[PDB]
Design a binder for this molecule. Structure first.
Ligand SMILES: OC[C@H]1O[C@H](O[C@@H]2[C@H](O)[C@@H](O)O[C@H](CO)[C@H]2O)[C@@H](O)[C@@H](O)[C@@H]1O
Ligand SMILES: OC[C@H]1O[C@H](O[C@@H]2[C@H](O)[C@@H](O)O[C@H](CO)[C@H]2O)[C@@H](O)[C@@H](O)[C@@H]1O
Ligand code: CL
Ligand code: CL
Lengths: 318, 318
């Protein structure tokens, strides 16, 4: 009596005729964005569906005018009910509600509805539709992602990182001139503080990101000034949110050596690097029931990073 | 033996005449927002200054046209030089540069400039001006906050929080119905997932918040549902950023009991509260040199909080 769970929830209602179809985003996380439904006297006549990745297909044969539902980003199902045509030979009706307060009811027009089949919408995130059609919709179900435990973007790579040439802007923090007219050496302490705002951003479709809290397990591009110039590095892997902002007061204390009969001008700066480059990674969705749905993705990473505070001293003779 | 440090850095240049003035934001963290300078042949004639809290004072007696510098929020000094008039009796010239690339030079017109006094602007955040004036500016200095280690908003209170009436909006997550037409009760597993976005923000003058990374040590208002209705509570003190946003996938697994010969409607929802209320607190600035600047502040807290996921079941016959 072993028990198998799945990342998706699908209950098909109707008869056994027609030819099989599967129109879902279980390959790439795409969701149902729009649905057109044509009804007949004793069946659902046809369905045309659009997924968030641009796929568009029609099942059954349209007749007359259609009812539409357009889903907006983050709009999930709150409930779903299907009816057969009462004769066990066709789908008869579709009823659903969404988390934005929308409702949709399309039903056959001649025969009355009999047994209602209320569905578990899982997470509410609808991956699409599965069933059988021919002239009509013989049977159909809506596929849902089951209730989600975590959604992690991981195995992140930046394919062009090693070709990228860092665009570093200089930010002036402070300058001071010191003067030593004595014939002995002198030392001057200089303290520096500077707010740095580090940012990380990994692009993702608004519908997926608005529905799920995506944690990122990734290194980020980092900037540092070395001898030859500015170096970009693929940083160590850690946890981030999809959009992240970290603020800090970066500080430094410097002791400047001011030699006899010379003035030393001290220039303190920091470099701000803007990153904008493609990433690849894997979305791993872990459902509450222990199952996993995963797929490969790619998008754009945007980031702001800072170098260390840099101190530059120049000796003058006056 | 002992060494004394101060939160502020002030170096006054000029003579001993005139009457003392102090025009700074060391009481409330106000910064110099605008300065007008009138020059004469052998002195700075007058200075009018505006602080970011709206204060406005003139020192010395204006004559002729003025030069202006207007500082924008986050604009700090990078360097400053002052000159006397050469005779040690008046301020002779002011020169400064800002971290937005600005420069300002105002000087007496007839007598030549002699010894330059280059100043340490500390953090670059200018709290105002201090000196002596009568007919002219006898002497003046610009006061800076010294290089900052940490800036913390602390001892936060919400003085209206106990009077506040909960205004919780319901978000629908999931509804489903089960039918038990047998003479024995049944059990149904229902799993729920739901993204919540919790926010917190404490208002702060842009000038101060643009320049320093402000950490917040405060409790936030939180919302729960109890027997009576909704309950606002002052949460436990912890660390936040000045603007904070945290995402989480709230989850819940429920066993629904379906009594014999009954229909059970299951309604899964969550409450979202939008807090918008005043706060008081203490800004504590800790300088790199170990000194501290502290003042009471007042502002507006905004925040989005959520209740726990709520399952309501309602049983019907048939
Ligand atoms: O989807 C319904 C049905 O369509 C196809 O059968 C057709 C219909 O029954 C009707 O239009 O009459 C046609 C011929 O008289 C018939 O082909 C099949 O795909 C069928 O399997 C399906 O159930
Ligand atoms: O700020 C300079 C100077 O102003 C005041 O002195 C005045 C001026 O020297 C001049 O205008 O003549 C006036 C008349 O005798 C004189 O008051 C004083 O406040 C002085 O202390 C100050 O140094
Ligand atoms: Cl049926
Ligand atoms: Cl002088």
């Amino acid at each position: 009596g072993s028990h198998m769970t799945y990342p998706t929830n699908l209950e098909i209602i109707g008869g056994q005729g027609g030819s099989s179809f599967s129109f879902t985003g279980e390959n790439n996380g795409a969701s149902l964005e729009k649905i057109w439904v044509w009804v007949g006297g004793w069946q659902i006549k046809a369905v045309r569906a659009w997924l968030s990745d641009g796929r568009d297909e029609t099942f059954g044969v349209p007749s007359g005018s259609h009812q539409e539902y357009v889903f907006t980003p983050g709009e999930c199902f709150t409930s779903l009910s299907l009816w057969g045509n009462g004769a066990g030979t066709r789908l008869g009706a579709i009823k659903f509600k969404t988390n934005k307060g929308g409702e949709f009811f399309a039903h056959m027009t001649s025969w009355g509805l009999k047994t209602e089949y209320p569905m578990d919408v899982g997470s509410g995130y609808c991956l699409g539709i599965v069933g059988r059609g021919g002239s009509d919709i013989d049977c159909m179900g809506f596929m849902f992602l089951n209730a989600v435990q975590s959604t992690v973007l991981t195995n992140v790579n930046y394919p062009t990182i090693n070709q990228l040439i860092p665009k570093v802007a200089t930010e002036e923090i402070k300058s001071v001139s010191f003067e030593n007219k004595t014939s002995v050496k002198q030392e001057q302490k200089v303290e520096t503080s500077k707010k740095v705002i580090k940012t990380s951003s990994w692009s993702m479709t608004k519908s997926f990101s608005s529905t799920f809290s995506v944690e990122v397990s990734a290194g980020i591009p980092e900037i540092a000034e070395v001898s030859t110039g500015f170096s970009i590095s693929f940083g160590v892997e850690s946890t981030h949110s999809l959009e992240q902002t970290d603020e800090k007061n970066e500080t430094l204390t410097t002791t400047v050596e001011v030699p006899p009969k010379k003035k030393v001008d001290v220039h303190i700066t920091i470099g701000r690097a803007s990153f904008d480059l493609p990433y690849t990674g894997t979305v791993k969705i872990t459902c509450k029931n222990g199952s996993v749905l995963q797929y490969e993705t790619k998008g754009q990473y945007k980031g702001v990073a800072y170098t260390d505070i840099k101190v530059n001293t120049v000796e003058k003779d006056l």
